[PDB]
Design a protein around this ligand. Sequence first.
Ligand SMILES: *[C@@H]1O[C@H](CO)[C@@H](O[C@@H]2O[C@H](CO)[C@@H](O[C@@H]3O[C@H](CO)[C@@H](O)[C@H](O)[C@@H]3O)[C@H](O)[C@H]2NC(C)=O)[C@H](O)[C@H]1NC(C)=O
Ligand SMILES: *[C@@H]1O[C@H](CO)[C@@H](O[C@@H]2O[C@H](CO)[C@@H](O)[C@H](O)[C@H]2NC(C)=O)[C@H](O)[C@H]1NC(C)=O
Ligand SMILES: CC(=O)N[C@H]1[C@H]([C@H](O)[C@H](O)CO)O[C@@](O)(C(=O)O)C[C@@H]1O
Ligand SMILES: CC(=O)N[C@H]1[C@H]([C@H](O)[C@H](O)CO)O[C@@](O)(C(=O)O)C[C@@H]1O
Ligand SMILES: CC(=O)N[C@H]1[C@H]([C@H](O)[C@H](O)CO)O[C@@](O)(C(=O)O)C[C@@H]1O
Ligand SMILES: CC(=O)N[C@H]1[C@H]([C@H](O)[C@H](O)CO)O[C@@](O)(C(=O)O)C[C@@H]1O
Ligand SMILES: CC(=O)N[C@H]1[C@H]([C@H](O)[C@H](O)CO)O[C@@](O)(C(=O)O)C[C@@H]1O
Ligand SMILES: CC(=O)N[C@H]1[C@H]([C@H](O)[C@H](O)CO)O[C@@](O)(C(=O)O)C[C@@H]1O
Ligand SMILES: CC(=O)N[C@H]1[C@H]([C@H](O)[C@H](O)CO)O[C@@](O)(C(=O)O)C[C@@H]1O
Ligand SMILES: CC(=O)N[C@H]1[C@H]([C@H](O)[C@H](O)CO)O[C@@](O)(C(=O)O)C[C@@H]1O
Ligand SMILES: *[C@@H]1O[C@H](CO)[C@@H](O)[C@H](O)[C@H]1NC(C)=O
Ligand SMILES: *[C@@H]1O[C@H](CO)[C@@H](O)[C@H](O)[C@H]1NC(C)=O
Ligand SMILES: *[C@@H]1O[C@H](CO)[C@@H](O)[C@H](O)[C@H]1NC(C)=O
Ligand SMILES: *[C@@H]1O[C@H](CO)[C@@H](O)[C@H](O)[C@H]1NC(C)=O
Ligand SMILES: [Ca+2]
Ligand SMILES: [Ca+2]
Ligand SMILES: [Ca+2]
Ligand SMILES: [Ca+2]
Lengths: 389, 389, 389, 389
Amino acid sequence: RTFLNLTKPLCEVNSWHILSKDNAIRIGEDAHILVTREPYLSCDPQGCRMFALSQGTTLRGRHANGTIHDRSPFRALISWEMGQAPSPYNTRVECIGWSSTSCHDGMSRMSICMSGPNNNASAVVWYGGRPITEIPSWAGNILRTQESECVCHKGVCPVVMTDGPANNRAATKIIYFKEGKIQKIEELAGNAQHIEECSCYGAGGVIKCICRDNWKGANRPVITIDPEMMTHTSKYLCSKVLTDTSRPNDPTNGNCDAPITGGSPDPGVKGFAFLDGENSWLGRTISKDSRSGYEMLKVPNAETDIQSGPISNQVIVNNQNWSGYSGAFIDYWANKECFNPCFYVELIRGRPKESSVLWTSNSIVALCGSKKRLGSWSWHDGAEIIYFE
Amino acid sequence: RTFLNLTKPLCEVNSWHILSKDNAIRIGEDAHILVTREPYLSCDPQGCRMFALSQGTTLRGRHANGTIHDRSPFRALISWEMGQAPSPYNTRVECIGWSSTSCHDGMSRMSICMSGPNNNASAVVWYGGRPITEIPSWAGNILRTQESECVCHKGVCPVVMTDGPANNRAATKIIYFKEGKIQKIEELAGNAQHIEECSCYGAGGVIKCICRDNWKGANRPVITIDPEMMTHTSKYLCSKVLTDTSRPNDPTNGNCDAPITGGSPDPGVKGFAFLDGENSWLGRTISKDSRSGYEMLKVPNAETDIQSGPISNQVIVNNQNWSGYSGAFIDYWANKECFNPCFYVELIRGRPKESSVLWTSNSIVALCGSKKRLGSWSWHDGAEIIYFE
Amino acid sequence: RTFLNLTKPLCEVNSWHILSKDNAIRIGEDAHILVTREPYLSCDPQGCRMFALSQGTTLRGRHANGTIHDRSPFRALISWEMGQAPSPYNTRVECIGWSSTSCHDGMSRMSICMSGPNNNASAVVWYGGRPITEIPSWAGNILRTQESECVCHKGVCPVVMTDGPANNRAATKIIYFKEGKIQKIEELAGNAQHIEECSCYGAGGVIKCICRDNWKGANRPVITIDPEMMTHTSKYLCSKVLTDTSRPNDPTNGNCDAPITGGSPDPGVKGFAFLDGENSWLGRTISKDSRSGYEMLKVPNAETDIQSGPISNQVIVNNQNWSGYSGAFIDYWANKECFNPCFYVELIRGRPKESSVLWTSNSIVALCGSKKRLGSWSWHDGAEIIYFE
Amino acid sequence: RTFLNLTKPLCEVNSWHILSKDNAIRIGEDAHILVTREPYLSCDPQGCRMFALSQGTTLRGRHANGTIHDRSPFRALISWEMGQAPSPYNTRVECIGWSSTSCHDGMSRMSICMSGPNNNASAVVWYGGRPITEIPSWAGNILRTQESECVCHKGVCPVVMTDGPANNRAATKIIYFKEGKIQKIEELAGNAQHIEECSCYGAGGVIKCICRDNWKGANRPVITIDPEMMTHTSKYLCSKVLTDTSRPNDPTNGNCDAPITGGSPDPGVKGFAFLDGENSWLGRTISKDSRSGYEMLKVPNAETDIQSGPISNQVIVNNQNWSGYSGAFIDYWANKECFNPCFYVELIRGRPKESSVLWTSNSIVALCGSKKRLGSWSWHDGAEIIYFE
Ligand SMILES: *[C@@H]1O[C@H](CO)[C@@H](O[C@@H]2O[C@H](CO)[C@@H](O[C@@H]3O[C@H](CO)[C@@H](O)[C@H](O)[C@@H]3O)[C@H](O)[C@H]2NC(C)=O)[C@H](O)[C@H]1NC(C)=O
Ligand SMILES: *[C@@H]1O[C@H](CO)[C@@H](O[C@@H]2O[C@H](CO)[C@@H](O)[C@H](O)[C@H]2NC(C)=O)[C@H](O)[C@H]1NC(C)=O
Ligand SMILES: CC(=O)N[C@H]1[C@H]([C@H](O)[C@H](O)CO)O[C@@](O)(C(=O)O)C[C@@H]1O
Ligand SMILES: CC(=O)N[C@H]1[C@H]([C@H](O)[C@H](O)CO)O[C@@](O)(C(=O)O)C[C@@H]1O
Ligand SMILES: CC(=O)N[C@H]1[C@H]([C@H](O)[C@H](O)CO)O[C@@](O)(C(=O)O)C[C@@H]1O
Ligand SMILES: CC(=O)N[C@H]1[C@H]([C@H](O)[C@H](O)CO)O[C@@](O)(C(=O)O)C[C@@H]1O
Ligand SMILES: CC(=O)N[C@H]1[C@H]([C@H](O)[C@H](O)CO)O[C@@](O)(C(=O)O)C[C@@H]1O
Ligand SMILES: CC(=O)N[C@H]1[C@H]([C@H](O)[C@H](O)CO)O[C@@](O)(C(=O)O)C[C@@H]1O
Ligand SMILES: CC(=O)N[C@H]1[C@H]([C@H](O)[C@H](O)CO)O[C@@](O)(C(=O)O)C[C@@H]1O
Ligand SMILES: CC(=O)N[C@H]1[C@H]([C@H](O)[C@H](O)CO)O[C@@](O)(C(=O)O)C[C@@H]1O
Ligand SMILES: *[C@@H]1O[C@H](CO)[C@@H](O)[C@H](O)[C@H]1NC(C)=O
Ligand SMILES: *[C@@H]1O[C@H](CO)[C@@H](O)[C@H](O)[C@H]1NC(C)=O
Ligand SMILES: *[C@@H]1O[C@H](CO)[C@@H](O)[C@H](O)[C@H]1NC(C)=O
Ligand SMILES: *[C@@H]1O[C@H](CO)[C@@H](O)[C@H](O)[C@H]1NC(C)=O
Ligand SMILES: [Ca+2]
Ligand SMILES: [Ca+2]
Ligand SMILES: [Ca+2]
Ligand SMILES: [Ca+2]
């Protein structure tokens, strides 16, 4: 019917309610479920779908062996009806490659996938299921993007992409698309020193992207995008509550304008946050060292006050269970007068933390905000690894 | 499309014709069929569909082991095309949780699931495939609901929920919904002493819910709802013909206002009845001790006459086979001048009655009223347990 | 969309071309294929589907064992997109039971199934996917029907049914439906002495049904129905070319008005022919004793001349391979000025002919006429029974 | 919705971007994937689909054994959503047989399959999912066609067919269709000496077909068709860059009007090229002897200059991996002012090159033109033959 406008404010959030869970690993023990990683969700005027990067093999298949590997010619972005597990019989192939993003502009879905060798990858940008535009690498070092949904306003959909070293300064750009065609390209500007795997959402005409600094900061960079002017600024989350993985203990003060460093042994993980003054929530793994457990912390003024701490918390996945990437999404077409925050968490099973199996895959759980105070429990993966031995 | 208005009477019923049967256990022995329980059926303007709570594993998979357990973070309400068996490939996830209800108001389907730990469950109410409202536990003891369809009139859909002990006085409420939003909440009133798992149907502007008293009565409670004023009354089925399971022999007289006690060893099962004067039918298991066999009895005036007995009978499942839950639905959108009574019977296989397997699951059979005098036979499950050993 | 009128003549047929083949057994050896029997095809404004009675188990499943049995509470009529093999994932349940018919009247599809014990069966008649009418057994002996498509004219669809012994005089009726409601019922009239499994088609306002006399005749009965007046007559195929299975050698003369006896060891099989003066074709098995091979014979005047012999032939399945039931259907909605005859052949595999396995099932092949002189080859099933040992 | 016409010019092409890949052998090691060969892709106003000839058994099934054999009554043309692997659950049967072509005219799709014994084969021509025409073998020796998409202009769709010897002079015709009806038949004319398996595309009101001369030449025949006059001419690709398989080294000059002999040990393979002045590209396998590797060569004026050589190259499948047939297609309904070239490569696994398994099958990769300078990597099949032993 119409191009989506981001005019609505964000809903008040006081707790999180379950939206969907696919139990993909429990089911994939017997049924023919695709191996995946890097999942997310995205909505359109008719409902929500799950997305992820297949590895082009089933979980029980002998080719599941060696699926710790991030990049091959056999991966592809695939989408399916929210709640089902991803099989070869229920999935649509959005595009071919090993890094992706996707979003619907109110009229049609744009989907983007990078593929190719490390020194020569390229993106193919699709719209309405047809390929529209190709983008070659500009720094010859693994051209990559969000791994969760992008956001559109009046037909303009910004996408953050990076090309360059994972462990040093790199070349990030924001590309503004309309119907899959490049409208403008900007070089990253501001105080964020390294940008990866941006988790983005919109409200009141503004798009905010909470990302992964894989170089220095255990605090997460924040890009603020104006989709009408097609301009942006960048900096860090102000809060002393650090939310990247492999982080040190939370300091006495955060820093709005420079990375807070430290932690061991990993340099980062995709994550997210909703930032709306008092109404601010940050997610993070529970363990400061590894991708284990997951908590949501309500931290008033996190985007602007270096002394902000948590006033409430919700365990999403207990610390005895494995988590992974986490990213934001919103059902912008809800029949509501405010945009209601949602998020998912990738439940990674297999290697390298579970090395008694030869594969690496995941399942999905997703939740959405509530104004009420709802009880909670842990929504871990649920599969028994001994069954796959 | 318009709102369903309950303007028509019940059709006359003199026997029952076969509507559907999914043979899920038979087919699940090889093809990839999800483990379920608490199934049911519900219709809309286009047709009827089957529903149940998945356990988030297939029947031959290793995770089927332990599915006797009722509540987990891996259960969800799923629905599918009537007659098909539920596989991971042909089921839509309606909501996540371990107790549910659903119904179509003539415009869209409302679905409701409860999830969470015992002392802190919440319901999420969906409308048109999107989440609308959340309701937290009010008594801190397994908030739960019907396990069969709800019924709407002019957009108003009442739901019965209980929170509190299973073996003592609890806190039942009736919640009136419209487009997923709460219109009114009433506390349970009248002579019913305990309320669970109501099976409801509509005719002539009036909604009747036949329930499970898990505390005292082997006679079933009956709530009568007026969807327009949003008020109700409650009492017991008067008839001496007892229909709950683990019940004593039928006494000389029933009791309209108080429970008839006795029976061993189990406190109750979900069941149903159609109450319409002379045109009244009661379902029950054939065995008075176990969930085995299933019979329909025409007992005129069962609703109001403590002396009422059966005038005809129809065996639905012979007493050499396992039954389970049973509930009501109607195709309110049929091209008829009256509303024709339908019902389903859950056919439970595995534990605890068949402990040579490690799982528990169910198939479905469903039948509807006929004014003719149709022959009958047993519609048992039909799987051979030894093939699963 | 309007009601189909049989306003057109039969196309001239000089040859038969391949329309569809599902190869269900070859595929069912590994993938999850439902056991069936008694298949057929039926078309509507949009296309053609295949139909069959499922046994409620896959072919490699342990419940395939014992599927020689014709009647059980686990059978159902299922329909699927023409060409595919029937799996639990791509099949629609039309109705429940162990004998059926189905046809489209231009607006919606009517499907009918009979179920129940031998001395008490009943038919349920469906229209647009809803139950409309119920019909109790009238002779207390396996109420049963065509096992191929019925035909409609101005919204009236006649159906031929039989109740009574298989080896003696039985009671056959013609029931005329309109949107699944009974318009009129007639007892069988004329000189056919027993009727079973009618294969019917329409042309120039007249319905012809070629049937199976299971009692005495190796020649097949023919019923001619006028769908506007709702009347019929009956007799036998006049040709000396006998086409039932288990027949004696063709005699010097046929018999229009009485059965011709003889044949070992089978009392009959479902069959068909198209009867149109010089343009007339008779199907039959190649073997006179058994369900083996299949051939099409152009026998001018077979309907009126006891001396009529073949002038052209086409082998459809060679005599080293198993056949089964056969029946007529036509795509009444084709973009052609005449109605072109089509037919299928059921290819039975397993018991009793192939007793090294425990099951009985089938695949399908279908063909339609051509005015050209096309070459041909055998379309046998194609599976290797050793693979299932 | 209208008849497509071919007035637009070909897009400029400087490199090739990934369009789709199905990973069928990888996924079919465990999931239930049909065995195929002779694939291609074809598009319509809604998108693009993959096509291939099934062998009517899955890859892991016992009936896979023996699938090197080309012709059987079990083969059929199947199509499915682009990117998925072909299983029994998501594939549409287009027509029955062992050699095919198909294409959409902007209103509906035409599909053609040949079937039958070597000496008496026949083609059935389908339009909009309905059979329209049959055509008998004229030379009595494996009537056969393109094995990739045909092309349409203003309702007229030409198709190239051959009947006659594989290793000598044969009888090739062009038949012109409109809604499945024959508008004209022509004998092959011009200097091409033998024609098989033409790969065709349209531009500037003209259709060019790049074929396989199986008789003498390692250079490829080129048939130029005018779909308005319904007439054609023929000769050979002029370039010294030879593109058929089993070919000698490239000579110093090609030959426009006669075959260039040599190569061992195979007489040819299906291949393609796009011919547009300086904007011309030729595909071929990397190995001169065998179906291994695959490369794209930009060769300015290949269609007219015998001295023309490559100015740029892109490896599509490396020379350590198996390839196979290759063909052209275009998405004629893209939103662009030019027709952008696309192509596929068939990735043959199993026999005869990999004789440790009993089967032959394939997977698919397809790419399209880019005006940009995109990097590349190999798109080989991906499966480990040792997992099938
Ligand atoms: C039922 O579930 C609800 C929702 O999870 C629980 O409410 C949570 O309760 C904990 C502990 O009472 C609260 O932690 C308070 O947290 C702040 C910030 O972390 C901390 O500074 C305080 O010392 C205190 O621990 C948490 O805020 C609250 N989360 C909510 C309401 O979202 C409730 O406890 C559960 N009820 C039962 C009976 O288990
Ligand atoms: C055929 O089925 C019908 C329907 O169930 C049977 O009719 C019932 O008859 C029994 C025995 O007289 C009564 O107790 C029931 O009240 C009747 N029930 C209904 C629903 O009508 C009939 O008995 C069966 N006939 C045979 C020969 O078995
Ligand atoms: C294209 C690509 O390789 N993406 C990968 C990125 C980057 O490798 C790192 O963020 C370092 O840049 O993150 C992962 O490796 C990771 O941390 O689990 C997974 C993901 O597949
Ligand atoms: C899922 C899991 O077991 N997490 C455990 C982790 C991991 O074992 C290590 O991080 C792996 O190196 O160790 C902890 O000390 C932690 O980090 O909180 C306890 C936690 O329960
Ligand atoms: C929410 C929940 O656990 N519901 C369960 C109820 C309750 O146990 C009783 O109604 C007592 O409240 O009945 C069952 O357990 C049962 O008897 O088979 C099944 C069902 O899953
Ligand atoms: C399915 C089945 O076998 N049911 C039988 C049951 C069960 O064996 C017990 O309930 C097990 O506890 O026992 C009966 O006496 C009964 O309950 O009526 C007879 C009935 O045939
Ligand atoms: C309802 C029913 O059982 N129909 C069956 C009929 C009857 O046996 C005969 O027509 C005698 O009435 O034919 C079969 O048995 C047969 O010959 O293979 C198959 C079919 O299932
Ligand atoms: C499929 C097959 O082998 N059919 C053969 C049959 C069967 O073997 C017998 O009917 C077994 O009862 O026997 C024939 O004489 C016949 O009936 O025509 C020859 C035919 O080739
Ligand atoms: C109908 C048919 O058999 N087509 C086959 C053709 C012809 O055999 C040859 O082109 C010689 O005519 O090509 C193949 O054999 C081949 O070379 O791989 C495969 C294909 O199945
Ligand atoms: C996939 C593969 O292994 N290809 C190899 C082939 C084949 O082994 C032979 O053609 C088998 O006949 O041999 C080569 O010399 C060639 O043809 O270029 C090297 C190439 O790497
Ligand atoms: C797994 O892959 C490794 C390396 O590719 C190989 O050595 C090993 O044999 C494979 N293991 C299995 C169980 O397939
Ligand atoms: C079944 O589950 C129990 C408890 O988790 C476990 O001890 C046992 O090993 C499992 N048995 C099988 C056969 O998987
Ligand atoms: C070709 O199609 C275009 C677009 O619909 C149309 O404008 C044009 O008239 C057509 N050309 C011819 C020659 O039919
Ligand atoms: C494969 O087919 C051949 C020839 O039909 C046969 O000899 C052999 O037994 C079959 N092999 C297998 C493993 O089935
Ligand atoms: Ca970091
Ligand atoms: Ca009770
Ligand atoms: Ca007979
Ligand atoms: Ca050649």
